[model samples]
Target: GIDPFTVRTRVSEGLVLAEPAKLMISTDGSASTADLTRATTTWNQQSNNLGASSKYVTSVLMDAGNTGVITITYVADQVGLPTAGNTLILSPYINDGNTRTALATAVAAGTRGTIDWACTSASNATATAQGFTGMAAGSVPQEFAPAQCR
Candidate 1:
């Protein structure tokens, strides 16, 4: 239904400016940043690998399992919302051992659906078609945003 209205144009201001889009990483854990003895190690590896994207990750949960949500936005040159069949992907790398990288969870670019990754070690995730209500965390994630994602 709402997929009919998803925009697929070059977002000059949204993509160029330093803005954040909220992303949900479906890794269940009962730990928070404080719980990690070496949060810096994880942070360092993640930040360094991001390669200059304006992505601000707030490590707010973890153990018995919680949804890991992140705030991300594109850098200067890398751009464009996925056109019809193309998709948007999110990969949250954790320091499993010496900068181990996680897999990228994907949702269709124009579909209003829920996106989540199941495995922990990581793999290329499949896409979803559920009604996520509005837009997703794709190249043009502008539908559902949080405070930091503005």
Candidate 2:
């Protein structure tokens, strides 16, 4: 079952390009040599570009050969100014491709039990910001982890 009151929203700037957002799945639970995916999306819902709304979803089939860890990287382009911040609305749902059956929601870095959400800025030249993988926050300006999205 899905909860209507548990929805959240993620906001990003318009001029900035949300390109090259990488998504890695670590089936073996190891960060090294992870299977990375080219997951990039646009936040400008008004502009109908990049197929639909510029947002994409990376669906990794969790089968016998599937990894356990999932990592999302949001990188800011070097051509534009740095992004001050971004917001990710974390909601509880089952990635099992079915109904939402989770007890609660949480967004954080690393393996957060089952689901977590995280974020970072593009200040560092050679760093990629990690995104929220699960759960939602009770208030605005939520906290996240600091990493280079390996």
Q: In order, what lDDT does every prediction score?
A: 0.26, 0.23
Per-residue error for 115 in candidate 1, Å, reads 10
RMSD of each: 14.3, 14.7
Worst 10 residues of 1 by lDDT: 118-127
**Per-residue C-alpha lDDT of model 2 across residues 88-132, encoded as one tens digit per residue:** 222222233332232121111122333222222223211212322
TM for every model, in the order presented, reads: 0.23, 0.19
- The ten-residue window of minimal lDDT in model 2 covers 37-46
**Model 2 bad stretches (over 4 Å):** 1-26, 30-77, 83-94, 100-150
Index of the highest-lDDT prediction: 1
lDDT per residue as tens, model 1, 1-150: 233122222222332221122231222111333322133233324435441233222111221121132323433123333232222323233333332222221111112233332211011212222211222343334432221221
